[PDB]
Design a protein around this ligand. Structure first.
Ligand code: K9M
Ligand code: GDP
Ligand code: MG
Length: 168
């Protein structure tokens, strides 16, 4: 079984750091913000062997037909914000609308991810994030790519959302 996961969110939120923690169990201080790529990882989730194909989105904000085509192949999306960046939380609505646009569905597996949970400099309340995820009908997972808190949970939870969708 294979799962096409897409990691979206504003520059600097930790998309690349989360991806490399999942794949390689290492925290990257610097990952070129211009590198958009997909990584495959074989994992066992609830006793099911699966291949996770994880697209780490990057580069420039642009909307070619081709870009839509890449993004539309995603079966589930991590909507990543950073808890120290109010703007990245405000941008979650944009990512949610672009997913709704390219998938032509209100029923798309997503997980809201609050990254950089290790930082003291919080500007986005857990309450707000939980309220937003409740309004969207999706899980919320707090993560730190730095300490690896919540990383397996964020990705495995998205897989479980895809399975629940495939049952419908
Ligand atoms: C700092 C560099 C970086 O990580 N990025 C992330 C992606 N960027 C971005 N900013 C705003 N909106 C979008 C993007 C990436 C492309 N996005 C996009 C385009 C077409 C279709 C879809 C579908 C679902 C989600 C996103 C989509 C919009 C800035 C650079
Ligand atoms: N403290 C802390 N720093 C992080 C975390 N995740 C990413 N970073 C750092 O934040 C910066 C941006 O991370 P990156 O993964 O490139 O974000 P992207 O632009 O969304 O791919 C990098 O210097 C990372 O090391 C985190 O959970 N905690
Ligand atoms: Mg990146």
């Amino acid at each position: 079984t294979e799962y096409k996961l897409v990691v979206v969110g504003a520059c600097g939120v930790g998309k690349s750091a989360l991806t490399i923690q999942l794949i390689q169990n290492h925290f990257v201080d610097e990952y070129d913000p211009t590198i958009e790529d997909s990584y495959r990882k074989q994992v066992v989730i609830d006793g099911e062997t699966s291949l996770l194909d994880i697209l780490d989105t990057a580069g420039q904000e642009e909307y070619s037909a081709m870009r839509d085509q890449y993004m539309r192949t995603g079966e589930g999306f991590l909507l990543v914000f950073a808890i120290n960046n109010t703007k990245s939380f405000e941008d979650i609505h944009h990512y949610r609308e672009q997913i709704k646009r390219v998938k032509d569905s209100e029923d798309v597996p997503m997980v809201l991810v609050g990254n950089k949970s290790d930082l003291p400099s919080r500007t986005v309340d857990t309450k707000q994030a939980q309220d937003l995820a409740r309004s969207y009908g999706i899980p919320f997972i707090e993560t730190s790519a730095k300490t690896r808190q919540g990383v397996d949970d964020a990705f495995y939870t998205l897989v479980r959302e895809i399975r629940k969708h495939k049952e419908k």
